[PDB]
Amino acid sequence: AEKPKLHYFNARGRMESTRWLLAAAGVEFEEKFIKSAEDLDKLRNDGYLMFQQVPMVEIDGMKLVQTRAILNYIASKYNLYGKDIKERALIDMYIEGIADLGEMILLLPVCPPEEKDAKLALIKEKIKNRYFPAFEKVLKSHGQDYLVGNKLSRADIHLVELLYYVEELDSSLISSFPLLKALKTRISNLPTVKKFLQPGSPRKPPMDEKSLEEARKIFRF
Numbered sequence: 001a002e003k004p005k006l007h008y009f010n011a012r013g014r015m016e017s018t019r020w021l022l023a024a025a026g027v028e029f030e031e032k033f034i035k036s037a038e039d040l041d042k043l044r045n046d047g048y049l050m051f052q053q054v055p056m057v058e059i060d061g062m063k064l065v066q067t068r069a070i071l072n073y074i075a076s077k078y079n080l081y082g083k084d085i086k087e088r089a090l091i092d093m094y095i096e097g098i099a100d101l102g103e104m105i106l107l108l109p110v111c112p113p114e115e116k117d118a119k120l121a122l123i124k125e126k127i128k129n130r131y132f133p134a135f136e137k138v139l140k141s142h143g144q145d146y147l148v149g150n151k152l153s154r155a156d157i158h159l160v161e162l163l164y165y166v167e168e169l170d171s172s173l174i175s176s177f178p179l180l181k182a183l184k185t186r187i188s189n190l191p192t193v194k195k196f197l198q199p200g201s202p203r204k205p206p207m208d209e210k211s212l213e214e215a216r217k218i219f220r221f
């Protein structure tokens with residue numbers, strides 16, 4: 001057999017949620033880091049990127065691009081996408097809300113400076129008034145340890161990943177949400193996730209100015 005190969009640059013960006021999901025599932029993977037525009041052009045010219053973009057993951061004979069296509073395949077393959085169509089609908093609704101908030105946070109480094117204060121404030125307001133109340137309500141509704149089906153799913157993984165990013169922005173935002181705090185602790189203690197959180201794993205740090213400059217050179221923006 002062959003390990004999945006993750007093509008991206010050496011940063012969180014749009015590949016980090018896949019790193020989290022594979023690690024949580026206990027699946028070993030390799031990474032091939034793009035370090036220059038030439039490296040990206042070589043993937044393009046070799047025919048490996050359907051829309052000439054990364055993330056790309058080589059898995060099970062496919063060269064899959066598009067974050068959501070990659071994640072959906074991995075979640076189904078490793079039994080992290082619920083047990084039927086209705087559970088998948090709940091999972092999809094939850095994770096698309098997570099993705100909407102995650103996208104706002106992802107794009108902060110490219111926000112025009114004159115708009116950044118207001119953008120950050122609006123994100124914090126949405127966390128406190130829209131997203132954290134919605135997920136706290138799910139957990140309170142059923143009283144169970146996981147978001148869907150009383151069993152670990154991708155929704156728990158994606159949410160807990162997001163909770164780490166929210167903590168980096170403002171550690172007080174989760175303070176009024178005890179069920180979210182408890183979920184963060186439980187998921188972080190699962191053996192595979194605990195290992196991924198320790199040093200030396202593929203988990204990536206927050207993007208710094210040097211990494212942003214590298215992204216500008218690689219992706220030509």
Ligand SMILES: N[C@@H](CCC(=O)N[C@@H](CSN=O)C(=O)NCC(=O)[O-])C(=O)[O-]
Nearest residue numbers: 013014052053054055065066067068219
């Ligand atoms: N919807 C796609 C977006 C992929 C994408 O935008 N990739 C960028 C780098 S990731 N940070 O956004 C990319 O390859 N840019 C090069 C280009 O579009 O020419 C996805 O995979 O999620």
